[PDB]
Design a protein around this ligand. Sequence first.
Ligand SMILES: CNC(=O)COc1ccc(-c2ccc(C#N)cc2)c(CN2CCN(c3ccccn3)CC2)c1
Ligand SMILES: CNC(=O)COc1ccc(-c2ccc(C#N)cc2)c(CN2CCN(c3ccccn3)CC2)c1
Lengths: 306, 306
Amino acid sequence: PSPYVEFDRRQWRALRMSTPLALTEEELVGLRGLGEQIDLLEVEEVYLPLARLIHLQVAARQRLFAATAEFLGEPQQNPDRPVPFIIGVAGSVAVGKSTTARVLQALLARWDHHPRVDLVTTDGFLYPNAELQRRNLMHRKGFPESYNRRALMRFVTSVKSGSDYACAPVYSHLHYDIIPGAEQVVRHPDILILEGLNVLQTGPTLMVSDLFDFSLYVDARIEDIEQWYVSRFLAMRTTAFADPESHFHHYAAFSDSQAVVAAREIWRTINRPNLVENILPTRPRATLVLRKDADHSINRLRLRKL
Amino acid sequence: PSPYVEFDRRQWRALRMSTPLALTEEELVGLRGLGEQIDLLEVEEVYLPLARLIHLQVAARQRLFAATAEFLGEPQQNPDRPVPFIIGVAGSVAVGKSTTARVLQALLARWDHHPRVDLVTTDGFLYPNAELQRRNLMHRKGFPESYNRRALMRFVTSVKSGSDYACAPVYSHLHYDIIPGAEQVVRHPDILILEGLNVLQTGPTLMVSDLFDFSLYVDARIEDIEQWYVSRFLAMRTTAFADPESHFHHYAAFSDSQAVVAAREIWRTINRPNLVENILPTRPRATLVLRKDADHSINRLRLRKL
Ligand SMILES: CNC(=O)COc1ccc(-c2ccc(C#N)cc2)c(CN2CCN(c3ccccn3)CC2)c1
Ligand SMILES: CNC(=O)COc1ccc(-c2ccc(C#N)cc2)c(CN2CCN(c3ccccn3)CC2)c1
């Protein structure tokens, strides 16, 4: 007896679902536009149905809002509309959270019940590099205390409170730092997706996940994520590290053997221990856990029983 | 701009709430035999409408279950029925959690949608006195570590897994201990109410409130609860303290004057610190906070925006 309904990929594919679910050509162009590594078969067979499932929870919450408001005789202090529906997306560095989040964002927006779907990464809530240096935390970027938790909690509370205006800072992956001045404005979307390492982490009191209506954890074997991380580092020699401005420009000239050593050392000393200590223990808190094969294909889905 | 909608008693009274769905006199009879800190008026004006509000959420979750099962084409690995809807009830010792829980049990059971409503206290998950002594915890009964959290978590997981059978140990207040070999059986009820000081407490990983569909915190001024605690202690001289076998039999003989001194000392040294450190910070985690005045009448309701 488990708290989850479990499917492997084969079972999932074989399901006789009650839809009518197919992507539009307009959508296939859009979905290429947000990467390319993303397998379109993945999107059609797994993420599209997953989106419909989530859509059922969003519509249910919107109708509960209406039934409750009617029951209360719409008092003045009740909001006139449902507050945004907030989805957490958690998992290891390099597991593909950002891709999953971006795919879900594009698929969920296609229902007229909730056409406005925003995406915020908690990367924008990291303390900037100097502030991290000050705190002896440069080697722990992505650990819980490397983020401004108070600011993160204020932002999510503002959105959940039904504010028409809420503001998040922005992180540059190119520069490895917060862009001073930069802001992302959120204006009462129907759905907000909140993607990050730390979204399902707990705290002594009200925590950001107390405000989630749904959450995903993107999972994979630790050895496989290590390989993805190493490949990403090697591929970065051409992109992020190629700029003579980069603080990591020296890595561009590392040949495959030395690059694998540098990548694995960084994995072993920062990202892997952050996963073991801080991220993995949050995995059972997710509404939906998606596990990936070594080839990046989803091999298993666990959904909390309703 | 807040995550909750707030009503004081006068506004709650003023509301044009849909349909009385009023109470039979034979039900009101049963309602007397479980309250005293819940008056007839409180049932009529507060608790009954609250039960309707909660019923709306239970019904929504039942229908979401069915929509979801149908979308998936009711596969083998999906349960045939929704798992139990679990309601947490938290607050200070002597705030009236047990009475609130018993009233909600009686009211929520009045719908055909969910006639089977179980009630479990976390007192059953206290370590037995022998284990508490071993652990230097005799002065800390009700504090987070005084409970076998692992066993509590296992019980709630078993219930949310849709088990046909889940067992909780039993705590005797009269004997001030777990009853050996005693168990409460819970058999897939439609709704389980889990009542306890500690039900909204946080932890490093999966916590019991992760498994809740709705939660209530019973609130009051710290000085008002102290007075209720004192009255309670004084009353126990005639009842639980009367038995020469009681661990607290020596308190039976205290005059009113001296009993007040003892009660306030116990409040000051155990229960109040527990409230300040461990119980009060969980208050913002509740879906619904009910605040009571000095004579036990609700003066304020704060409900999470839907
Ligand atoms: C995005 N970059 C890579 O994947 C591979 O490149 C590096 C290179 C250096 C470092 C690094 C160097 C020195 C220290 C020290 N002291 C620490 C790291 C990191 C490390 N990453 C850790 C995870 N970081 C996070 C974590 C959460 C959100 C955004 N970024 C990105 C930097 C990644
Ligand atoms: C069962 N008794 C009462 O409610 C009121 O009287 C007393 C008397 C003594 C004590 C007491 C005496 C000595 C130590 C030591 N060392 C500790 C307590 C307590 C203390 N209560 C704290 C809260 N306890 C809880 C807390 C949660 C669930 C069930 N019981 C009941 C005992 C309550």
